[PDB]
């Protein structure tokens, strides 16, 4: 199956409570493996998976350097964006950035993402060609022109194509026991309206459907690396389709 | 035994290029990024250049930007610095350093003198 690495960065401006808070998270598939919080005492990249702790201290040094550079960039970014929008200094504003890569079952490059959002709305998105930008509002034109003058699209494309894919392959090889694992969803029915439950499966991708002669909740993390989901219909078979299932399961009361 | 050895220093006239080579023995050279750091005679230490473990990321100081090129070759376990358009400001003792980390391992080369005059 296709495996993806992503990095999510959130910077929130605090009006007078101190410097803006910065949080960075790194995900492989649906499993987090790093974490940086600006208010944490360590102020270093922290491992959140058993396998990633195998990396030597030079890896953590490099990660901390990069993440602190990102923190400084976002701290500047909040101010420059407020200036671009001519917003008042009183309000708090949020800045989000997500970037990463995907690999297919053949473990070659398949897709790359880079996205920047201001106040929960799309601001600047790297296109699928990975050589151009997509800008929505007027300040986004200025940001795109500055970025094109900086030639950052080529650098980001090179990173996503080579380094993200190579290190995703390395992480998956290191975490073969956990990352390359499919768990069959334990499925059962409860009658009261019938609720069809799929519990303790991985990854989060599942499809539950209800058919008569042929509500839903977003998949929630169980907290132990597996997920749960259920679909209820008020009154008929529940069909569960998962990557880890050789054939989809059907349940009737 | 960890060891860094630098060669290529000497007297050079202004406007001419010089090459410095630092060979590392006793530790895994291919995993760590390396720095070139110069010290003027009687002056404090100044950072010149830095290179990553791939050699993909290289950075230079503001004073030496545009004239210095750092390189590494992990096959021969060597770290090179090519200095172009040398001026009277470029005279100093140069060191190749494996440092600037958090686990406390640093190795300093002997340091070779580069003097610029006529």
């Amino acid at each position: 199956g296709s495996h993806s690495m992503r990095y999510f960065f959130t910077s929130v401006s605090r009006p007078g409570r101190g410097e803006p808070r910065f949080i960075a998270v790194g995900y492989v598939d649906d499993t987090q493996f790093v974490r940086f919080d600006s208010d944490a005492a360590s102020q270093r990249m922290e491992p959140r998976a058993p396998w990633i702790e195998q990396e030597g201290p030079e890896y953590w040094d490099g990660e901390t350097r990069k993440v602190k550079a990102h923190s400084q960039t976002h701290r500047v970014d909040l101010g420059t964006l407020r200036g671009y929008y001519n917003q008042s200094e009183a309000g708090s504003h949020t800045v989000q950035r997500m970037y990463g890569c995907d690999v297919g079952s053949d473990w070659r490059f398949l897709r790359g993402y880079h996205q920047y959002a201001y106040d929960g709305k799309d601001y600047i998105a790297l296109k699928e060609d990975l050589r151009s930008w997509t800008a929505a509002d007027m300040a986004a034109q200025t940001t795109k022109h500055k970025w094109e003058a900086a030639h950052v699209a080529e650098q980001l494309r090179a990173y996503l194509e080579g380094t993200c894919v190579e290190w995703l392959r390395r992480y998956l090889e290191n975490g073969k026991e956990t990352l390359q694992r499919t768990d069959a969803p334990k499925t059962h029915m409860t009658h009261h309206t019938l609720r069809c439950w799929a519990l303790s499966f991985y990854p989060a991708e599942i499809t539950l459907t209800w058919q008569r002669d042929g509500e839903l909740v977003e998949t929630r993390p169980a907290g132990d690396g597996t997920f749960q989901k259920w679909a209820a219909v008020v009154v008929y078979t529940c069909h569960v389709q998962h990557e880890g299932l050789p054939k989809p399961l059907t349940l009737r009361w | 035994e960890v060891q860094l050895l630098e060669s290529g220093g000497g007297v050079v006239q202004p406007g001419r290029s010089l090459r410095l080579s630092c060979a590392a023995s006793g530790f895994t050279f291919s995993s760590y990024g390396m720095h070139w750091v110069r010290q003027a005679p009687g002056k404090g230490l100044e950072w010149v250049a830095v290179i990553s473990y791939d050699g993909s990321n290289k950075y230079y100081a503001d004073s030496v930007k545009g004239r210095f090129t750092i390189s590494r070759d992990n096959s021969k376990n060597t770290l090179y610095l090519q200095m172009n358009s040398l001026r009277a400001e470029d005279t100093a003792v140069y060191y190749c350093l494996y440092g600037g980390n958090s686990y406390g391992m640093d190795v300093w080369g002997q340091g070779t003198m580069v003097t610029v005059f006529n």
């Binding site: 990660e63 550079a69 990102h70 420059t80 920047y116 500055k146 900086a150 650098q155 980001l156 290190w167 | -």
Partner: peptide, 10 residues
């Protein structure tokens, strides 16, 4: 690993 160059924003 995080990106080195290109993190510069806005």
């Amino acid at each position: 690993k995080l990106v080195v160059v290109g993190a510069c924003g806005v």
